[PDB]
Assembly symmetry: C5
Homo-oligomer: 311 residues x 5
């Protein structure tokens, strides 16, 4: 079959609608999310019009093979969506009402810089390539754009499911293409992060600061180096909870700073020992006494600078 | 083919039944479980009515392509189920008895707050979208709802397989949808958790408490800090056994508390040393002597409080 | 097509045979294994009988679509098997010789209680659902049940591939079902376990026992606690080699006991130190001297008890 | 259908063009990447020529089955691409404008020697096997070779998507094969590697150098050995970040050198102690004093040498 | 279609060839390797013979559906190969020249005993099952057996791609089967193994040996135990590089021996301390002095013995 012919020289409008049934498998590393939804399509084909009085039925139901259907594809999918045509409905004027249920793995880039206080906009881009006989343009029927109340993505608050009504019409491979941006807005449930990541990580670092109320070089070497091991071990433990970003994140910056602090605490411990050994105990004692306040203060400050620097 | 026509204006009743053959791959992280079951369907399609005497046969057998079959889908599946029609049997009144064997990856949210003493209700939601000519309504034939005795989910006790008889009939995208809730009830086999997770984790903590019968600051630093490392390594070891919950679980609150205890034990060890060093050995000794009882008591109390809050 | 009609009132006998070509992907955690095998089927359909003289042929070859074929399925598969009909052959009496090559992922429960001295019986359950016109019964042709010599499952000795001749005939959803139990017997190759798991684990534990020839509390704390870390580190290293059982295994009991031993060794080390410190060195010395024999003896006794309980 | 016949003795030219829609799953270990793109094909088939006046059409649209289409394959794919013919258009002269959307997993060797300062050229090799009647030759239409602006590969800067215009025409299995090299140029985003990999790794090594301002053999053994553990623990933490190269990398050579440094630091610590114990404290002190400069200077010198060898 | 009829009573010869296009995904654990190649087939079908003169063609080209093609399968594949018929060409005598491009996941057992100095022979077994009318026998056309020069398997040197010309003709499921052994010979690239695995592992063990130049029991306990932890940590670190063998490998024998050495070093350290403490310092000193030579010598000797036993 060929596309419906234009009355004048106008493009064909395909009214689209996505209704989210299920959201699952948000892969932080792959930057992909699996989605199960309805895709509704509507357009006028006058070749399929009929006088309801002459005809035999109000609405004529067709098989996909029987009539012309626009080839709608998704831009940001790994492979083509798995679709199952639920219904095709032709009214007396030739207004086609298409409906399919599809599942797809959608590639949408993620920004982990504010982890775990991040929010994401997941995109589903609808596209239609224009044909030889006439141009095809996508449109949004907002009555057919929604999401099931039960839609969930463990660890996230599902904010909204909307579409940018104005399509992106552009040329590609010598033909017009009309694109639609459907947006799923999600924000992370950051609470567990405090008792799970930050708090135990801070306790380890705080244990290293006890070296400031000790003069035993052996006990101090043990405190600093053994906590450093505990820190790395704890990091190994929480690897999984942190996302795949091969770029600097807020949490990643706190963590880097904590590594610097272990190194500085070693310097202090080393300095204090050398001074004592090299018969300068008054300096050694004044440095250790200062560090007791200097360490928490410089830490707490650098964290406000970090927080501010990120938010 | 079109749906069977109504005699008056009545909806079509599709009598459903699911019989569980196999239950497998319960993914605590994905919140998905895989299923292999029979799906039985029964409706009346008078266009198929026959005379047993002319036909010879008491029951007619058809291929799925030959007759109209209702489009039943599952709401909470990853992709459409893999189905194989086992049998289609038409009696002369036009009553169709459909049967298929299907496998599906079902998405059902899980609540790990009580892990490992958690129980779950797994849902399989059956759905049918009504058509232009007539409304379709789902029903439950309880004689056809069951599960194979051999059905297992390693680590769980399979309690029951039932269906909420009353369907959820509602409107969606300008058409009626009739939904059925099939429930698989499971409860976790928590025993192994004691010798596997808790007991070795408690022994490590108890070793740290021996610092309360020691005055050697070096030996105490080694006890606390090395046990803390042992705890983190033990935690990495049991990572897998613990579920994916990005929220606070019961097992999780105990693990957080154990981290707090290591920090408090460090404070004590540090305090006791400073007092001794700052010529106050009587206080140092009274604090250590108190700690011996304080630590187990406060621990035992806080664990009772936790259990109470979670259960 | 309909099933062949009964001469009297007899059920139809389908003679089955499975010949294992390949066995791969034994997943200890999923309790699943993948299989590539031939499935042979045999029955008599007198409607297919021919006079070889008129036909000029001794044997007629058919396409699966052309004739009636019994619907054989497997009970314990994740999804339906991938099959390719190799041959369909008909002899003048109406005897059908069916053959297909199939691959399938089979779910079979495993018992890890005796690991690594465990043996497993893998099950492949063949099934046929009876029809309205006649009952269908499965049978085993043992000449037709075999396995390729090259069939392997790394880490296991493939003992036998057989079938329990007597089918399990039972009623399900108001129809007869004839089931066949095909068994693949495997026994674990436990040798590598000694140099890979037990021996290094025992050496670490034996190092902690040297604390019984030392009076240095600091050296003893280091011996017991550092070996405990080494043990946990070693467990982590061997995680993979140990299976997924969420229940107590033989190796699992030994490992738990080894954790108890580290705790007891700490108690001793702590006790010996307190007694010394609290001016009772004779008791401290007698406890340490006893421990030297008590520890290996109680260990060796407890292991004999465990072995006995498990075997 | 047979290929279009030659007017003289000329080969058939198939003008190709790949337009990258999506790029995902760059697997550093597998040396594979996934791609979603348009494949455009152009050729003149005079048998398809038509008079637009008689036909009433300016352009004829065909189904792939209806006309002859060249069999284009990709050399370096895991399995054959998943393709969906978007459009086939014929103009009155017999020009065929083919277009398909395809997804494919591409195998392209990677060179990790300069990690994380490495750049890669990804290859997608297009191929056509010539037929009995005429030779088929591939060509590149550069206007039709592009990539979507949104194309990303997390951790990489996507430099260019081009094709080596000159095809590689060669004989294989007694027939001509015309090959096209499509190149996707990528360069690694190395910044995060400094705060993530190198800096914490260098701090650990620097802590070991403090043993050169200490005479306590016990404190020194703790410094060197505990940092060695921390280093190994740190590598385990960053295993994932480093690529799969089973050959020597730049990062890899630095890491090996750091292991040598821990060994040398042990020798020093051991030597200094033996001399001190064997009543030669002046030598012990001069060795330690030298080490303070020798260690950083030699490390710095060797890194300069390494950088030079790799760049 | 039926197979070509025999002139006398002779079997049909199918001349085979495999030309390796791609070699990828060699999975050491699964013992599977992925292949992408051409499969060439040639056989005589006199029903297809023609006179070039009254036909006008030198060669006739057919569609797979038009003529009879032998059903060639692979024995050791997980699922059936993905094939795409490239060309079918009949010469005047009736000789068919078939060609397809296929990809397949081949199961071939691997022997890791000599790792990393191990070589492997990967098998691709071609098979044809004989038919009712005539027997089918496989043959090797060596002109059509090859591999692309660019064929690679990261970490291996691709030695050769050959076929054992003489087929293995045998009976299976009451019918003749003709098998062909195609061999891909690979040998491992063992270089980084030295700087990556062995060298850092030997440095850790050498650090432990420093305890033979020390009399401090505390320093010695720290040296032996902390290096033991570092060793285990290093193992956890190199797990990935070592293959899946659940049997004793060459590298694995060295590793086991290294565990024994840590245990022996502990015994020495313990013995030396007891003797000193029990007023026998001359024996303690002579044992430690001996150990200094005994340890490296016994190590170097048993390594020579092991190498000899494995090679
Ligand atoms: Cl799509
Ligand atoms: Cl479904
Ligand atoms: Cl099956
Ligand atoms: Cl391809
Ligand atoms: Cl195959």
């Amino acid at each position: 079959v060929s596309p419906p012919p234009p009355i004048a020289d106008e493009p064909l409008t395909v009214n689209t609608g996505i209704y989210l049934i299920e959201s699952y498998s948000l892969d932080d590393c792959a930057e992909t999310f699996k989605v199960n939804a309805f895709l509704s399509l509507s357009w006028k084909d006058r070749r399929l019009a009929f006088d309801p009085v002459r005809s035999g039925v109000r609405v004529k139901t067709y098989e996909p093979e029987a009539i012309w259907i626009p080839e709608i594809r998704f831009v940001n999918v790994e492979n083509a969506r798995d679709a199952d045509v639920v219904d095709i409905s032709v009214s007396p004027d030739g207004t086609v009402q298409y409906l399919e249920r599809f599942s797809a793995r959608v590639l949408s880039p993620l920004d982990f810089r504010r982890y775990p206080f991040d929010s994401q906009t997941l995109h589903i881009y609808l596209i239609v390539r224009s044909v030889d006989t006439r141009n095809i343009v996508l449109a949004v029927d907002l009555e057919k754009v929604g999401k099931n109340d039960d839609v969930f993505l463990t660890g996230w608050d599902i904010e909204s499911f909307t579409a940018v009504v104005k399509p992106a019409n552009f040329a590609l491979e010598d033909r017009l293409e009309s694109k639609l941006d459907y947006q799923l807005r999600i924000s992370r449930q950051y609470f567990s992060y405090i008792p799970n990541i930050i708090l135990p990580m801070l306790f380890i670092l705080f244990i290293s600061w006890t070296a400031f109320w000790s003069t035993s070089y052996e006990a101090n070497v043990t405190l600093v180096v053994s906590t450093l091991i505990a820190h790395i071990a704890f990091n190994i433990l929480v690897e999984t909870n942190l996302p795949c970003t091969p770029y600097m994140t807020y949490t990643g910056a706190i963590i880097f700073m904590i590594y610097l602090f272990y190194f500085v605490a070693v310097i202090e411990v080393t300095v204090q020992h050398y001074l004592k050994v090299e018969s300068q105990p008054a300096r050694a004692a004044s440095i250790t006494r200062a560090s007791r306040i200097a360490f928490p203060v410089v830490f707490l400050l650098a964290n406000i600078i970090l927080a501010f620097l990120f938010f």
